[PDB]
Amino acid sequence: MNKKMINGGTVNNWICINFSRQVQDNLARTFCQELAQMCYVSGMAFNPEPVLPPVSARPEQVEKVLKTRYHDATSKLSQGKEIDLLIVILPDNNGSLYGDLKRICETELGIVSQCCLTKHVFKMSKQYMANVALKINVKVGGRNTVLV
């Protein structure tokens, strides 16, 4: 057996920010589409299209890009709605970027974020996507099986 979604969460409204210089915007797009698809077929409600296209940003600009893209997506949503998920593409070795971003999303924006390292973004293996989908599901309040 492998873990499965018991209850799938709902991601109606999501965006993507990329921080890796190896990743072009259409690769970020493709990656997020594959992930969206995996989440869906696993049992989530998951919008195949983001609120805004993916943006590439310098790690140095983490606070400004998050807050700016958050405000812009969030302004674009029908009234009374919020961003369900931020998908973040990170460099494999990113130093303090990971901690800073989680701090900002958790304590400043109040948005669930899922980070994905560059090396995996290139490979897009179904096993990786399935694993990330499982992670996303529980973060947005879904339920997964256990194996033990």
Q: Give every CB contact of residue 23 below 8 A, 6+ residues apart in sequence.
A: 56, 89, 118, 121
DSSP the chain: ----EEE--EE-SEEEEE--TT--HHHHHHHHHHHHHHHHHHT-EE-SS-SS--EE--GGGHHHHHHHHHHHHHHHSPTT----EEEEEE-SS-TTHHHHHHHHIIIII---EEEEEHHHHHH--HHHHHHHHHHHHHHTT-EE----
**Domain parsing of the chain, residue ranges:** 1-148
**Other Cβ atoms within 10 Å of 4 Cβ, number:** 14
Contact 74, 2 (CB under 8 A): no
**Strands 5-7, 14-18: parallel, antiparallel or unpaired by DSSP?**
unpaired
Q: What is the domain class of 1-148 according to CATH?
A: alpha beta
The C-alpha torsion from 107 through 33 and 2 to 8, rounded to 10°, is 60
Residue 126 structure tokens: 């179904």
Residue corresponding to tokens 């970027």: 97
